[PDB]
Design a protein around this nucleic acid. Structure first.
Ligand code: MG
Ligand code: MG
Ligand code: MG
Ligand code: MG
Ligand code: MG
Ligand code: MG
Ligand code: MG
Ligand code: MG
Ligand code: MG
Ligand code: MG
Ligand code: MG
Ligand code: MG
Ligand code: MG
Ligand code: MG
Ligand code: MG
Ligand code: MG
Ligand code: MG
Ligand code: MG
Ligand code: MG
Ligand code: MG
Ligand code: MG
Ligand code: MG
Ligand code: MG
Ligand code: MG
Ligand code: MG
Ligand code: MG
Ligand code: MG
Ligand code: MG
Ligand code: MG
Ligand code: MG
Ligand code: MG
Ligand code: MG
Ligand code: MG
Ligand code: MG
Lengths: 233, 52, 121, 252
RNA sequence: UUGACAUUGUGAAGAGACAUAGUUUCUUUACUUAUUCAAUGAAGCGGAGCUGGAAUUCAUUUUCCACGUUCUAGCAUUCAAGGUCCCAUUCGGGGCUGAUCCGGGUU
RNA sequence: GCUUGUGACGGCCCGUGAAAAUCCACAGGAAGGAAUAGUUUUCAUGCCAGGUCGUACUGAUAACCGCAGCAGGUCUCCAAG
RNA sequence: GAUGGGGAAGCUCCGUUUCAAAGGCCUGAUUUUAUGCAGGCCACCAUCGAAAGGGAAUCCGGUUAAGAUUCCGGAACCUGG
C-alpha cells in the first residue's frame, strides 16, 4: 500500500522467466532407482501366473496386528536371558541334582525356512506366517500348497523384515507356532479361523486367477475414454 | 587494461564504455515509446473486453 | 505424508561424510632426517682462477652446490654456514653435470676476507 | 589386386570432412514447451557465410524460458530474411518467410525449408542452397502431412514435424561455370578430399575393375548389380536404365 | 540376400481339426512391458476442473473449440512484488497465496 | 629514392580466409557505509618476494645428413655507392 | 588419450561427454574450536599436443681469453603479497 506496489508477473510463454516449480516428476534418477521402479512396473504389465499372484493377496492390517500381538509373547530367548538360564541350569542342575529340568518347557515361535518346512511336513506347525517379499520368491512359493496339503492353517503376511523383528533377526521369511500356552490356546483358534477364511479356504479358487495384465495410467485413461465414446454415443 | 585507471575504460554516460552513445539514444527512445505504447494496447483491448 | 520437492531435475551424488585417516600402524617407523641440510647444499668452494677474481672484485662467493638445491636453499645455507648476508644468488648448471652458485654478498661483507676465513686462496 | 579408391574412402583418414572453419551445425530450436503450445520470438542477429556450405547461415537469438540468459541458434537463412528481423517459432506462429511452424499449421501450397523428418529432429529436409519442400496435402486423422521433396519424391511425415517458411538462400549457385580447374580446387578444398578424379579406365588392373588393356575401355557392362560386393561396385550401380535421357522428365 | 527356429509377449475379428461345444495352429489389425530409434543440464505429460464463448436447449446441458506474448535491432535474473498468516517484534526470517486438482509413465 | 612499418580505401571468391587461456567493460543492485565522525586502495607515495631447466660454439665447398674435412642435400632475419 | 561403460579367448579394440549418483568456489555459521553446517549459486565432467600460433613485465652504457637484453653501472616495468 504505502510506497509499496503491486506488480503481478506474467509467466505465460514468450515473456518472464518461468519460476521455480516442482520438477520432481521429471528428475533423471540414478539407474538403480529406475530399475527397481521398472522392475515393479514390468512385473504387472505381464500376465502373472496364479502360483505367484496368489501372494499380492496379503493379510489385512487389523488381523495382522492381532497376530503379531499374539506371536510376540512367544519371542525366542535373548542372549542375556539364555546366559541367565545357563547359570540357572549348569550350576543348580549339576548340584542340587535336577535332570537338566530345573528349566521350564520353552514356548517360542519357530522360524528358519528349512525348519518350518519339516515342521509343516510333520503336521507340527499350527499357524504359519509367510512373508510377501522374499525376492527369490521360489524359497517360499511352494508353501501355501504345502500347508494346504498338510492341513496346515497359514497366512501371507506383510513384512519379511517384520517377521524378523519378532525373532531378533533383521529379516525372517517365516514364523510359526507349533506350541501354545493354554492361556493362549483359545485366542489362536480365532486367529486360525479368520486366517483360514482369507487363505486356505480361498486357495483352490486363487489357483485359477492370473494376476497382472495392468496398464499404466496414460494407457488406462487412453482406453477408459476410447471405449467410452466408441460405444455409448 | 588491468594496469590502468578506471577512467581509461569508460565515458560517464549510461552504458559508458560499452555502447556508443548514438546507440544509447536509440535505446532510450525505443524503450520509452514501447513502454508507452504498451499502456496504449492494454486500455484498447480493455475496451474490447467491455464493448463487443 | 508425501514427497520431497526438488526444483532441479538433475540428481547429484549426495554430499556424504568423509572420515580422516586414523591408522593403526605408521608409514615408516622413523621419519627421514633432513635430506638437504646446509652441509649437503653447498658442497665445495669453486676456486678456479676466474672464480677467484669474482671474489676479489665482485664481492661474490662461488660455491659448487647441490643439484637438488634452489636459490632459496643456497641463500639460506650460505647465510647459516658463514654468518654472511646475501644480496642475491645466481646459479647455473656446469657442463660436468654439477651446479655453480654465484653468491653476491651485501655491501657490509667483504667476500675476500670471508674466503680465507673458510680457508681458501 | 589392390583395394580400390572408393573402398579406401570409408576408413576416413585423408577423407574426412574439412571442418575447421565451419560455423557450427545448422539446427532448429529444440522442440520445447514454447514452440509446441505457442510461439517464441527471436532476432536474426547476423546472417553469415559458412565455409563449404553454399547457403548462408542465419544466427538467431532467443530468450531462455527457464533461465535469465540468451540462447543463440544457427539457422539456415531463407531468402529474404534479414538482420534485425523478428523470427517467430511455434505451433501458433504466423505464416511469414523466416518463421518456423509445424506443417500441420500451414495450408497446402505452403513453401517450406529445413523441415524435420520426425518431430524434434531439428531439421533434415531441403537445406541446400535454393531448395525447398511443398506441402501438398493433409490427413487430420492420424495427423500426417504429405510433402514433395526437392528430389521429386513425395513423402508423408508427422504434422508436428517443423519447417521454416520460404526457400533457402543462395539460389542458382550452380548456374555459373566453374571455368577453371582452380575454382574446383578451392571448392573442394573447403569440403572434403574428393578432387580431382582419376578415371579407373586410366589405372592398371591392380587398382580397379576398369584398369588395364592395350586401349582404354571397360571391357564389361559398367552397370553393376546391387548385390555386388565391395571392390566390385564401380560405375552405374543398380542402374535401371542408361543412355542419354530423351524427353521430359518430371514425376507424373 | 532368402527361409526356418530361438529372442516372443497380450487382446480382437476371420480361417484351420477330435469329425456345427474350444485346447491348438496359421492370416488380417489392435495392445505395450521385451527389443529398436530419437531428444533434453529428463520442464510443463496424461487425466479432471476453473472461468470466455461459438453452439441449440425438446428439461438442463446432449457437447465442441478455445482458456496471458506479433507496428519498432530497448528492458525481462536476487524463493516475486502484492495479499495474508506466523516468530513475540530488531534486523532478520518463515508458511500459504500469487502459480487450480489428481497420477510420480522425462518426452 | 631503397627497405620496412602503418593507415584510409579499392579488387577478388560456388575460396569470404583458427581456437583457447587470459584481461577489461557494462547491465544489475544483494549488501555495506557518516557528523562528533565514517566510506574509500581501479589516485599518489611507501614495504617484501619472484622458484625450476636451457643459455658456450658451428649452422655449413670442414662442427648437421650423404661410410669422409664428399663440387650433393638441408627452414630463416638484417642488406651500402 | 585415461575414466563409468560396450566388444574381445586374450595381447587389447571402441567411445571422450559418451545409457554415469562424475564436483569446488565464495563467504557465512565458531567465540567449547577448530573448521562441522547454514544460504545461494556454477553443472564447466580428465589429461597430453606449438622453443614459428595465442601470451604480464627491461632498456641503454661498460665489462671477458671464452658469458651476457642473464654480470657490473644506471634507469625502469610486471605479477603476487
Ligand atoms: Mg519371554
Ligand atoms: Mg574515458
Ligand atoms: Mg549506476
Ligand atoms: Mg674490494
Ligand atoms: Mg638459469
Ligand atoms: Mg571429423
Ligand atoms: Mg587430392
Ligand atoms: Mg578424370
Ligand atoms: Mg572423371
Ligand atoms: Mg597406365
Ligand atoms: Mg580386377
Ligand atoms: Mg568385373
Ligand atoms: Mg580395361
Ligand atoms: Mg574408352
Ligand atoms: Mg519372415
Ligand atoms: Mg525431456
Ligand atoms: Mg624481405
Ligand atoms: Mg572480409
Ligand atoms: Mg575494454
Ligand atoms: Mg542476505
Ligand atoms: Mg594502486
Ligand atoms: Mg650466444
Ligand atoms: Mg665452418
Ligand atoms: Mg658437402
Ligand atoms: Mg581409448
Ligand atoms: Mg600443454
Ligand atoms: Mg609458445
Ligand atoms: Mg609461441
Ligand atoms: Mg653490451
Ligand atoms: Mg667471465
Ligand atoms: Mg660470443
Ligand atoms: Mg642491473
Ligand atoms: Mg635503482
Ligand atoms: Mg602491487
Amino acid at each position: 500500500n504505502p510506497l509499496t506496489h503491486s506488480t503481478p508477473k506474467n509467466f505465460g510463454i514468450g515473456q518472464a522467466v518461468q519460476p521455480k516449480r516442482n520438477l520432481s516428476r521429471y528428475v533423471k534418477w540414478p539407474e538403480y532407482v529406475r530399475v527397481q521402479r521398472q522392475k515393479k512396473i514390468l512385473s504387472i504389465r505381464l500376465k502373472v501366473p496364479p502360483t505367484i499372484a496368489q501372494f499380492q493377496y496379503t493379510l489385512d492390517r487389523n488381523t495382522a496386528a492381532e497376530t503379531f500381538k499374539l506371536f510376540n509373547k512367544y519371542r525366542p530367548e535373548t542372549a542375556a536371558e539364555k546366559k541367565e538360564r545357563l547359570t540357572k541350569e549348569a550350576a543348580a542342575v549339576a548340584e542340587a541334582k535336577s535332570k537338566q529340568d530345573a528349566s521350564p518347557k520353552p514356548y517360542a515361535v519357530k522360524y528358519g525356512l528349512n525348519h518350518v518346512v519339516a515342521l509343516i511336513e510333520n503336521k507340527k506347525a499350527k499357524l504359519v506366517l509367510i512373508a510377501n517379499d522374499v525376492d527369490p520368491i521360489e524359497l517360499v512359493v511352494f508353501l501355501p500348497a504345502l500347508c494346504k496339503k498338510m492341513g496346515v492353517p497359514y497366512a501371507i503376511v506383510k513384512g519379511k523384515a517384520r517377521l524378523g523383528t519378532l525373532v531378533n533377526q533383521k529379516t525372517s521369511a517365516v514364523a510359526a507356532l507349533t506350541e501354545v500356552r493354554a492361556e493362549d490356546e483359545a485366542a489362536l483358534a480365532k486367529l486360525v479361523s479368520t486366517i483360514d477364511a482369507n487363505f486356505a479356504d480361498k486357495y483352490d479358487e486363487v489357483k485359477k486367477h492370473w494376476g497382472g495384465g495392468i496398464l499404466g495410467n496414460k494407457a488406462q485413461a487412453k482406453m477408459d475414454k476410447r471405449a467410452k465414446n466408441s460405444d455409448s454415443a | 587494461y588491468a594496469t590502468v585507471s578506471k577512467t581509461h575504460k569508460t565515458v560517464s554516460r549510461a552504458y559508458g564504455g560499452s555502447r556508443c552513445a548514438n546507440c544509447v539514444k536509440e535505446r532510450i527512445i525505443r524503450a520509452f515509446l514501447i513502454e508507452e505504447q504498451k499502456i496504449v494496447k492494454k486500455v484498447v483491448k480493455e475496451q474490447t473486453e467491455a464493448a463487443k | 505424508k508425501a514427497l520431497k520437492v526438488r526444483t532441479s531435475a538433475t540428481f547429484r551424488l549426495p554430499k556424504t561424510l568423509k572420515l580422516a585417516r586414523a591408522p593403526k600402524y605408521a608409514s615408516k617407523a622413523v621419519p627421514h632426517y633432513n635430506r638437504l641440510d646446509s652441509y649437503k647444499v653447498i658442497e665445495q668452494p669453486i676456486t678456479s682462477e676466474t672464480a677467484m677474481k669474482k671474489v676479489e672484485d665482485g664481492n661474490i662467493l662461488v660455491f659448487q652446490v647441490s643439484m637438488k638445491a634452489n636459490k632459496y636453499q643456497i641463500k639460506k645455507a650460505v647465510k647459516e654456514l658463514y654468518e654472511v648476508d646475501v644480496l642475491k644468488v645466481n646459479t647455473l648448471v656446469r657442463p660436468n653435470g654439477t651446479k655453480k652458485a654465484y653468491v653476491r654478498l651485501t655491501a657490509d661483507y667483504d667476500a675476500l676476507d670471508i674466503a680465507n676465513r673458510i680457508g681458501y686462496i | 589386386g589392390r583395394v580400390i579408391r572408393n573402398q579406401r574412402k570409408g576408413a576416413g583418414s585423408i577423407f574426412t570432412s574439412h571442418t575447421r572453419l565451419r560455423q557450427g551445425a545448422a539446427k532448429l530450436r529444440t522442440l520445447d514447451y514454447a514452440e509446441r503450445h505457442g510461439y517464441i520470438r527471436g532476432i536474426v542477429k547476423q546472417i553469415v557465410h559458412d565455409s563449404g556450405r553454399g547457403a548462408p547461415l542465419a544466427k538467431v537469438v532467443f530468450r531462455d524460458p527457464y533461465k535469465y540468459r540468451l540462447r543463440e541458434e544457427i539457422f539456415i537463412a531463407n531468402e529474404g530474411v534479414h538482420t534485425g528481423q523478428f523470427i517467430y517459432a511455434g505451433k501458433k506462429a504466423s505464416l511469414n518467410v523466416g518463421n518456423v511452424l509445424p506443417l500441420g499449421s500451414v495450408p497446402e501450397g505452403t513453401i517450406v525449408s529445413n523441415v524435420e523428418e520426425k518431430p524434434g529432429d531439428r531439421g533434415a529436409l531441403a537445406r541446400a542452397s535454393g531448395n525447398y519442400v511443398i506441402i501438398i496435402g493433409h490427413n487430420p486423422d492420424e495427423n500426417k502431412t504429405r510433402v514433395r521433396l526437392p528430389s521429386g519424391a513425395k513423402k508423408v511425415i508427422s504434422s508436428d514435424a517443423r519447417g521454416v517458411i520460404g526457400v533457402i538462400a543462395g539460389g542458382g549457385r550452380v548456374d555459373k561455370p566453374l571455368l577453371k580447374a582452380g575454382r574446383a580446387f578451392h571448392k573442394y578444398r573447403l569440403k572434403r578430399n574428393s578432387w580431382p578424379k582419376t578415371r579407373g579406365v586410366a589405372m592398371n588392373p591392380v587398382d580397379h575393375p576398369h584398369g588395364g588393356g592395350n586401349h582404354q575401355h571397360i571391357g564389361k557392362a559398367s552397370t553393376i548389380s546391387r548385390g555386388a560386393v565391395s571392390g566390385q561396385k564401380a560405375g552405374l550401380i543398380a542402374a535401371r536404365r542408361t543412355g542419354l535421357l530423351r524427353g521430359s522428365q518430371k514425376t507424373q
